[PDB]
Write a protein that binds this ligand. Structure first.
Ligand code: 3WN
Length: 303
């Protein structure tokens, strides 16, 4: 179509399970283009569908531009064009850098604001359904030039129909990254007919992302090396069974160092992590509550 024909692909930046991401140039601006082959149409259409949700746009959700198709004369490519963020993922960003207390708050608060907006239902003519991500992880969050985050990779999301309490794709199977799966997802006790259960599972994964950020907070030169949650307990690419034995059976969570109690910002962050990590989903903090807590901390710090 008219958009893909005017875009020049410059570099393949990533190869995921669904599609390949490229840095492209559109009307002289950098854009990110996710390309799927003809046989991945279901995945491409679903992601285009979630990104076109009414009232979805928010400073902390990846800016979607357009879905399109491009025929090179041999095969057709299915495109999803979005805003380009040079830092890339929060995973890449935390591996490369350490952050200040201010930097940590900015990353955590923006992640929570994006999640609170996904989770929020807006009632009306131009109403927005509540949305649950189902695959929140530091590799699915991007860092913007201003040091704030935006949630990306919404292709596995589910949308709620509030009047009937029904989910748009009626999920009957476990999806997402095994390492970040909530205890109720790992042991398959989650009620997949209960939308609030998917919001609660996202909060647990956001808790693990906050732990990743806090390790990289550098105070008086003190900080931890980058690690994925459960790095000390499971192998790389862990199985459901491996995760379940740790999270559900032994009931372990990532370690919270006592030295996070000697700094106010880290203390608040530690308290949030613990309250995201309860085995009972109903006891977890909401994304709005986390946003309110970190907004108060940001104000106190003068960011
Ligand atoms: N869901 C979705 C759809 C289309 C592109 C993307 N990825 C990106 N978007 C914007 N900047 C980026 N920078 C670096 C790596 C990326 O992967 C990236 C995700």
């Amino acid at each position: 179509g008219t958009i893909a024909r005017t875009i020049v692909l410059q570099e393949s930046i990533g190869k995921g399970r669904f599609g390949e991401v490229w840095r492209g140039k559109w009307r002289g601006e950098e854009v990110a283009v996710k390309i799927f082959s003809s046989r991945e149409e279901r995945s491409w259409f679903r992601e285009a569908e979630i990104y076109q949700t009414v009232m979805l746009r928010h400073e902390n959700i990846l800016g979607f531009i357009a879905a399109d198709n491009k025929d090179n004369g041999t095969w057709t490519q299915l495109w999803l064009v979005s805003d380009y963020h040079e830092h890339g993922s929060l995973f890449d960003y935390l591996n490369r850098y350490t952050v200040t207390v201010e930097g940590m708050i900015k990353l955590a608060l923006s992640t929570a604001s994006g999640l609170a907006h996904l989770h929020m239902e807006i009632v009306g003519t131009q109403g927005k359904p509540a949305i649950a991500h189902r695959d929140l992880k530091s590799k699915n969050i991007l860092v913007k030039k201003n040091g704030t985050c935006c949630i990306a990779d919404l292709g596995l999301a589910v949308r709620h129909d509030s009047a009937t309490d029904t989910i748009d794709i009626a999920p009957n199977h476990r999806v997402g990254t095994k390492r970040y799966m909530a205890p109720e997802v790992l042991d398959d006790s989650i009620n997949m007919k209960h939308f609030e259960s998917f919001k609660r599972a996202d909060i647990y994964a956001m808790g693990l992302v906050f732990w990743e950020i806090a390790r990289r907070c550098s105070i008086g030169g003190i900080h931890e090396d980058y690690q994925l949650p459960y790095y000390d307990l499971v192998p790389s690419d862990p199985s459901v069974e491996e995760m379940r034995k740790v999270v559900c059976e032994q009931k372990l969570r990532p370690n919270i160092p006592n030295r996070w109690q000697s700094c106010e910002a880290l203390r608040v962050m530690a308290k949030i992590m613990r309250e995201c990590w309860y085995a009972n989903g109903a006891a977890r903090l909401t994304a709005l509550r986390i946003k309110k807590t970190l907004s108060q901390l940001s104000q106190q710090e003068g960011i």
